[PDB]
């Protein structure tokens, strides 16, 4: 019988630079009248910086607007911001995914069974992980094959990439580097190697 239809006025995918301001805004039609409007992030509720009002004062109005002001975004403030609204009949939600530019972060690096090496990087944009082998006596060029795989917080608002190689092919004592980079920066984990 009743309904709520949320229309985003800005793209529900948001890319921003560290320190940027952005407004998450929606217009929605609801009947009967909405209630318990709230913006949620990390399962917590904004008690400020947000506004929610009817599009018109006409007594037959059913269009509403709600806006969340996000200011000076830090790299750690990306993630899913959800708008929840309900009336005496229906629940509706809409998720905005905010991604803030940050250099890759190496979350784990491991020695696997069967001689494989693995490092896991998170960041935005999506980190590219290159592997380099450096003998005792410059290094190599990024090596293949590689098992790359997109994992699915913390950290929130980041694309997480798992990259694995087989160290078996490599010969001689040295150091293996897994470099995670993107347009923002780069980072590296190192494995010491014995033959």
């Amino acid at each position, epitope marked *: 019988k009743g309904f709520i239809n949320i*229309f985003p006025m800005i793209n529900t995918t948001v890319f921003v630079n560290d320190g940027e*301001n*952005v*407004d998450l805004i929606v217009e929605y039609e609801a009947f009967p009248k909405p209630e318990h409007q709230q913006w949620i992030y990390m399962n917590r509720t904004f008690t400020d910086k947000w506004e929610d009002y009817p599009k018109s004062e006409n007594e037959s109005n059913i269009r509403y607007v709600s806006e969340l002001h996000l200011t000076r975004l830090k790299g750690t403030e990306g993630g899913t911001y959800t708008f929840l609204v309900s009336n005496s009949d229906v629940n509706a939600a809409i998720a905005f995914n905010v991604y803030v530019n940050t250099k890759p972060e190496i979350l784990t690096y491991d020695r696997l069974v069967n001689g494989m090496l693995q490092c896991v990087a998170a960041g935005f944009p999506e980190p590219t992980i290159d592997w380099y082998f450096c003998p005792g006596t410059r290094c190599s060029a990024s090596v293949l094959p590689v098992d790359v795989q997109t994992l699915n917080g913390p950290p929130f608002g980041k694309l997480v990439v798992q990259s694995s190689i087989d160290s078996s092919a490599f010969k001689h004592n040295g150091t293996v580097e897994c470099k995670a980079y993107n347009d923002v920066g780069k980072t590296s984990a190192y494995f010491n190697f014995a033959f």
Partner: antibody
Amino acid sequence: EVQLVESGGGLVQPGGSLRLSCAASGFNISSYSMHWVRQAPGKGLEWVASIYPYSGYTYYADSVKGRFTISADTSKNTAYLQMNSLRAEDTAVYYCARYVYHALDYWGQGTLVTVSS
Amino acid sequence: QMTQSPSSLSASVGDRVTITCRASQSVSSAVAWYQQKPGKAPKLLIYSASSLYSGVPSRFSGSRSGTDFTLTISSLQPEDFATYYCQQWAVHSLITFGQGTKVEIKR
């Protein structure tokens, strides 16, 4: 860095028609609202119109309502103001600006629209 | 509706100037202030009444009367010559600009 560049302005005959464009770089207009603001020679700022490029929603001042049309191309990252039935009183510098937190934080350098015979 | 004052003023270098803005009764916080140098696009100084926009020097601040919004420039600088605008956002009237206040630097 962020950059806004208006273009397509110039001398236009009373009743004539003109179309301004605003090319944005350094941000996605579909994550914001874009506005046109005009300033008549030696006068103050006057809000003209706005648009949410993602949804296509548009808004107009009464003085231009039904006579101007604001639009946007999310792939070219460019907003437009189509001006019709131009008059001497519409003569001004037109700026495009990015809207966030109720203010206009980034502005173009402006383009002069002169309405004259 | 919206009203700004004074329309024009003259101040010395090192002075402290205060520009008042009378916004609609419905608007509670949505007030911004711009600076416009001659032949240039306006620059955002303050938003949401008291928030200082990045890159803008501390000389500028936004405050209250209260009930009326105020722009304040302390230690006025020779480069502070310009026209200053307040602007409001309100639900039914959307974006409205103030008449402007031209600041001449007494010398």
